[PDB]
Design an enzyme around this catalytic site. Sequence first.
Site, short mmCIF file in Angstrom:
data_model
loop_
_atom_site.label_atom_id
_atom_site.label_comp_id
_atom_site.label_asym_id
_atom_site.label_seq_id
_atom_site.Cartn_x
_atom_site.Cartn_y
_atom_site.Cartn_z
N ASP A 15 15.87 63.18 -74.50
CA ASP A 15 16.89 64.16 -74.14
C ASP A 15 17.77 63.74 -72.96
O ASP A 15 18.03 64.53 -72.07
CB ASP A 15 16.24 65.52 -73.86
CG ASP A 15 17.23 66.68 -73.99
OD1 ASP A 15 18.11 66.61 -74.88
OD2 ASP A 15 17.14 67.67 -73.22
N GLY A 56 14.10 79.04 -63.16
CA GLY A 56 14.22 79.32 -64.58
C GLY A 56 12.94 79.90 -65.12
O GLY A 56 11.93 79.93 -64.43
#
Length: 246
Positions: free
Chosen positions: A128, A16
Amino acid sequence: EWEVPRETLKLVERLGAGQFGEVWMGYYNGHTKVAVKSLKQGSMSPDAFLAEANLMKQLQHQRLVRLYAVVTQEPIYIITEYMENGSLVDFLKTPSGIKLTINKLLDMAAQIAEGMAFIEERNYIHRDLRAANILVSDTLSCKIADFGLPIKWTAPEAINYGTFTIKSDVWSFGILLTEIVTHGRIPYPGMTNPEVIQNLERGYRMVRPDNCPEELYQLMRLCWKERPEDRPTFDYLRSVLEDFFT
Ligand SMILES: CCN(CC)CC(=O)Nc1ccc(C(F)(F)F)cc1NC(=O)c1ccc(C)c(-c2ccc3nc(NC)ncc3c2)c1
């Protein structure tokens, strides 16, 4: 003792890329596969970037992705172990993940709870928790992680007043449970963020997912009590999930 010469590494594939740097799959000394988070220079201080590493040195546990090494001379790197099967949300969607029994799914959910219990024990807050931040080992075990930047997983108090606590994480865990039993389904099926925002201020709660045991759905509801202090501890959640099937 965490520093290693940059020469010991070979980046093979970029997983990524974003604002503060990149993530790559690589190898350390040609024998160990690893994931690497590299800081894009002059994007944020080396100090602030390495704070992530110092936190991982602190939080070592069987249920948490572990730090392997660090390279402190720009380009700054943070090296960790690499999980073959990637994230939980992705894996559950594969044939291999769809073929998993409710028994196996609760075992994986137990492991997650176990890691969160650890996190609770250490006064840490994830902020998260979601299946995307859960890594699946080569033996199908589950490890807690956090990759970076979506309301669907956040408790109301955190959303409304920015109050993120371990109780804020429990609620996220409830959301995560829905992901696990639908094999990857997005929570609040059909609803946009604005809609989930609206429904919540009305006390709405996710409807029971298909093929989700009734006892499991009530555990989720406990995770979703309006008042944060009414939500169970991750220790209690782990305990209940391991004994789910006596
Ligand atoms: C809120 C955001 N914050 C602030 C910066 C980040 C943060 O504090 N992170 C954070 C917070 C707490 C914890 C822990 F649980 F250990 F306590 C770990 C992490 N970081 C990672 O998980 C992580 C770090 C480096 C790498 C290289 C990967 C990593 C990325 C990708 C991967 N793919 C695969 N297999 C496909 N296998 C393994 C990996 C590992 C993952």
